[PDB]
């Protein structure tokens, strides 16, 4: 009713259908700070010990 005599339509669509609830889990990568922490200071030469 809110559409004209001429219709605007879509030929293709894409969506994901899952049959098992446990297929929603995926994986990502992170750095292990505990064993490979991020460096916080640059390398410097030794001078002015105090």
């Amino acid at each position: 009713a809110v559409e004209m005599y001429v219709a605007v339509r879509i030929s293709r669509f894409q969506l994901e259908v899952l049959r098992d609830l446990h297929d929603l889990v995926r994986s990502r990568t992170y750095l292990d700070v505990s064993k490979s922490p991020l460096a916080t200071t640059p390398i410097r030469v030794v001078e002015y010990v105090r």
């Binding site: 030929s11 293709r12 894409q14 994901e16 259908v17 995926r26």
Partner: protein
């Protein structure tokens, strides 16, 4: 069919089998979502389907998975020794066990001992030999060179090592049980499973041609049984039974997946559930 398998084959095969299983799963998922219409199923598969999230393979086209399989197969079974990291494949000892073999043994392979004492004929699941001369009980007549496993049925005029109906060894040898004169015949039948997989023979027939048109100097079209026997006879001597299965799974899955990508039918269970 000449080919040189490297010792790093299990590492390549663990990746190839995963790629094949992912492609089969994507094919099934996009196959259940097709509505009959203007576009053929080939166009639908080539457009919305073929999208897999797998590291080390940066192609979401059917052709991309096709040449990933080509490269992995060429590295694993034809070039020779080659380190997996060279092609971006991480080489890791920790891998997954492949599914167990389900190929029914119809033409089991045996090798007669020297001296021409006996003559061998084949049947659907049994071997029958005839004695050309007199033979005394307690000597070999046949031995399977292709490993076999399963139950034994209808053993006549001969004896095999078995308990409860199950063959004790993977390579049983038949020994005459009572001396026989006058050119009689001894029959041994089996209900056993050989090396390979049974489901998906239609896809293999076209996949072997697909990958023989490329490696024509190495591979020729043949039946699945002959291909499995040639592949098994060429494995390196010093490798465990765990790595052999992993190699052979990819060795058989590459042709069937290449064929499945042509005829967009279903996929066997031993490919999907890896």
């Amino acid at each position: 069919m000449n080919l040189e398998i490297n010792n790093f084959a299990p590492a390549i095969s663990s990746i190839g089998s995963q790629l094949c299983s992912l492609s089969a799963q994507k094919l099934l998922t996009c196959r259940k979502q097709y509505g009959n219409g203007a576009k053929s199923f080939e166009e639908f598969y080539a457009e919305i389907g073929g999208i897999i999230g797998m590291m080390g393979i940066n192609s979401q086209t059917p052709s991309g998975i096709r040449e990933a399989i080509y490269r992995l197969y060429q590295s694993a079974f034809l070039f020779g020794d080659i380190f997996p990291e060279s092609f971006g494949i991480q080489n890791t000892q920790n891998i997954k066990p492949p599914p167990g073999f389900t190929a029914p043994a119809k033409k089991l392979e045996v090798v007669l001992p020297q001296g021409g004492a006996f003559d061998l004929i084949y049947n659907n699941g049994e071997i029958r030999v005839t004695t050309t001369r007199n033979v005394q009980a307690g000597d070999l007549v046949c031995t399977v060179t292709f490993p076999i496993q399963g139950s034994v049925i209808a053993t006549r005029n001969c004896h095999v090592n078995e308990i409860g109906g199950q063959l004790t060894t993977t390579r049983p040898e038949i020994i005459a049980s009572v001396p026989m004169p006058a050119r009689t015949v001894i029959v041994a039948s089996f209900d056993a499973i050989e090396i390979g997989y049974g489901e998906g023979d239609d896809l293999f027939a076209i996949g072997i041609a697909i990958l023989s048109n490329r490696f024509n100097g190495q591979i020729t079209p043949m039946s699945r049984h002959n291909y499995m026997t040639q592949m098994f006879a060429n494995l390196p001597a010093n490798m465990s039974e765990r790595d052999s299965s992993a190699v052979l799974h990819f060795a058989q899955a590459a042709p069937v997946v290449l064929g499945m990508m042509e005829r967009l039918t279903g996929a066997p269970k031993w490919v999907l559930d890896y």
